[PDB]
Amino acid sequence: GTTYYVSSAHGDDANAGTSENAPWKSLTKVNDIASDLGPGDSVLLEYGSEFNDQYLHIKDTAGNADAPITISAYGDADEGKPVIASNGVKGSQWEQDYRANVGNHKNKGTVSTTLLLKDVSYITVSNLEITNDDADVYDPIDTWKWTDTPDSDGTKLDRSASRMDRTGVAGIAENGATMSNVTLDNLYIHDVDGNIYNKHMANGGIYFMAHYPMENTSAETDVWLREHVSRFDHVTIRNSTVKDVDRWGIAVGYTAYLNYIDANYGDGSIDDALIAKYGSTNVRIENNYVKGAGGDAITLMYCDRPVIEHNVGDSVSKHINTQDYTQPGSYGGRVAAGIWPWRCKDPVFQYNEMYNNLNAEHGNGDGQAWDADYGDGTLYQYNYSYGNSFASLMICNWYAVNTTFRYNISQNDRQGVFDLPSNGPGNHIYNNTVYVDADSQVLTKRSNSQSLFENNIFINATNTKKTETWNRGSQNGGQTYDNNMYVNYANKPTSDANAIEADDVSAVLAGAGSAPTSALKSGAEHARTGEKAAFDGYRPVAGSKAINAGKVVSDLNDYAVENDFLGNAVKGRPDLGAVEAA
Ligand SMILES: CC(=O)N[C@@H]1[C@@H](O[C@@H]2O[C@H](CO)[C@H](O)[C@H](O)[C@H]2O)[C@H](O)[C@@H](CO)O[C@H]1O
Ligand SMILES: [Ca+2]
Ligand SMILES: [Ca+2]
Structure with missing residues (x-):
């Protein structure tokens, strides 16, 4: 197809724009033809460019499986990624x-978006x-x-409740059809100064959502909307960085069709056909870094089996505090x-790191990793959380x-490790290692409900043998324990008839507490193997009471055991905690 070239420094908009030697100057020219982009067409922006007070809006078109639309860079990579900087200008604004x-929540209004994808399928945006x-x-x-x-x-x-909403990238489905095969790859999204x-x-770094194409005002609209679904499929967001944005870092899947997905809460189970029909399928969130979001880092909404892996979140909830969040109004x-799911079915969150979620001390009513x-069916496995x-x-x-929460490590998480506010049943927390400092404890004070804790290592990282509160409340049976290790405590849960007790974490693990205290400067995940491996303190030492002391777990949610936090196979009697002895 046709390749277009834009150069803020060299180009001219009188030019043709279809060859490198004679490129356009401004994005207005791309905007003028974007709805006619089709399979194999490409819009390349020159490394080193800065398109100020500009934006790219692509509506109601598509590539195809053989050849997508491509929005990317050309030139010398050392000149720096091309920059699209809308600065909120009127022309970026849409209803x-x-x-x-x-x-x-606010569900209608004016939004500024720097890069808008409205019902665009088979498009890859990169660099x-x-x-x-x-x-x-x-x-x-x-x-x-x-x-x-x-x-x-x-x-x-700007603390105004009516502050204009702003996105870096918005992915919008509102035609009553699937919007599919969108890939965002190696983007750097920052300074998106949206509504707090x-x-x-x-309103945030990257947001993908779905609307009804018309209001549901009659029996006839209702028959139609029940069968013609605005939704996503094959959305991949990878290798990207989102920094200094309000409100959300990365969110995908919120939908007007929650009116069908959430018509019948029942017992919390979500029907497979329901979520596949009305929700978003094959969503993948891979190798991203989210730092300094005003609110939440990464959230998947109304997604059928998304995969969320190898991301790092860091220092989010920047603005969820009493000084900055001053006009909550009726929305709260x-x-x-x-990094989390809302009304998903069997999402998988694996191999992510999450640091320093802010402000629980200053009005953040949550603050968890x-x-x-x-x-x-949320599956959290092999994730690290710190601070x-x-x-x-x-x-x-x-x-x-x-929920299943397994083979995770928690280090220096404050005010409690596990927070169980009136949750439903079926939750299984096993083979985690949790390092609990003097600013923390096992359960948050507010906890009152169900979880089954097995094969965990609980480490009291304080200077006396702590008498821990192992149980709070009794909703849905409360917390039951079996076959866990308790390191440097004076007591143990009364439910655990198979407790393993150890006096000194130094005879259990190589270097407890020595895992990272911050994200890598790059935002990449830490190595888990090789010279740079960052979690080797959590490996059992020779003769450790963790080795071969675990029960064969039967997952309440039918996820078979595969590997440990470091990705090594688990066979035989599992070792206690998140890391098999090698
Ligand atoms: C059940 C509940 O209150 N959950 C809280 C989350 O709030 C919900 O978040 C979804 C996101 O799609 C909607 O905004 C819904 O209306 C909310 O009730 C909240 O975002 C998280 C994180 O702070 O905490 C839960 O307690
Ligand atoms: Ca700014
Ligand atoms: Ca401040």
Whole structure:
């Protein structure tokens, strides 16, 4: 197909734009022809370019399986990714409308988006730097600190509840059809100075959502919408960085068709055909770094079996605090968690790191790394969490059901490791290693409900043999324990008839507590093997009471055991904790 070339430095918009030697100057020319982009067509932006007060909007077209539309860079890579910087200009603004109630949230209004994909299928967008900056908002994560006075550290915010919503990239389905085969790859999205509060406008680094094409006003609209579904399939977001954005880091799948998916909460189980029909299929979130989101880091909504792997989140919930979140109004929302699912079926969260979720000390009503929220079958495995301000894992309220949390390591997570506020049943927490410091404990104070804890190592990383509160409340049976290891405690859960007790973590693991305290400067995950391996303190030492002491687990959610946190096979009697002895 046709390849187009844009150069902010060299080009001219009188040019043809179809050869490298004579490229366009501005994105206006691409915008003018984007709806006619088709299979094999490409829009290449010159490395080193800065398209200021510009944006790219692509609507109502498609590549195909043989040849996608491509939006990318050309030239010398050392000149720096091309930059699209909308600065919120009028021309980037569009009217979003779900055309249904989507809960107690703003569902309609004006949004500024730097890169908009409205019902575009088979498109790959790569190697762009994307911003949406307000010169009057400045609060960089890299030097962020809690101040006794607002904005005293050379920062400034707009705290207005009516602040215009802004996206870096928005993926919008609103034609009553599937929008498929979208790939975002090696983008750098930053300084998207959106609205601090709004959770489900296209407001954040990357947001993908689906609307009804018309309001559901009659029996006839209702028959039609029940069968013609705006939804996503084959959305891949990988190798990207999202930094300094309000509100969401990366969210995918919120939908007007929640009115069908959520018509019948039942017991929290989600029917396979229901979620496949109305929800989003084959979503993959891989190798991204999210730092300094105002709210939540990465959330998957109304997704059928997404895969969320190899991401790093870091220092999110920047704005979920009493100084910055001042106009919550009737929506509320002064809460955020790290990397998590909402009303998904069997999502898989594996090999992710999550650091320093902020502000539980200053008005963040959550603050966890992980959150098995409402939904069915969430699998968290082989993830690391450090230094989160409120807990490693939440299981959230009645409709959070059938969670498995296994082969994870939690280090220096504060105020509790496990948070079980009135959650539904079916939850199974096994083969984790959790390192609990003096700012923390096993269960958050508010915990009251079900989980089955087996084969875990609990490490009291404090200077006395702690008398721990192992049980709080009794909803849905409360917390039951079997076949766990308890390191440096004076007591143990009364339910555990198979306890393994150890006095000194030094005779259990090589270097407990020595896992990372921060993300890698690059945002990449830490190595788990080789010279740079970062988790070797969590390997059992020779003769460790962890070795071959675990029960053969029977997963309550029918996920077979495969490997441990380091990816090594588990065979025989499993070792206690997250890491097999080698
Ligand atoms: C059940 C519950 O209250 N969950 C909280 C999350 O809030 C929900 O989040 C979804 C996201 O699609 C909708 O916004 C819904 O209306 C909310 O009730 C909240 O985002 C998380 C993280 O702070 O905490 C849960 O307690
Ligand atoms: Ca700014
Ligand atoms: Ca501040």
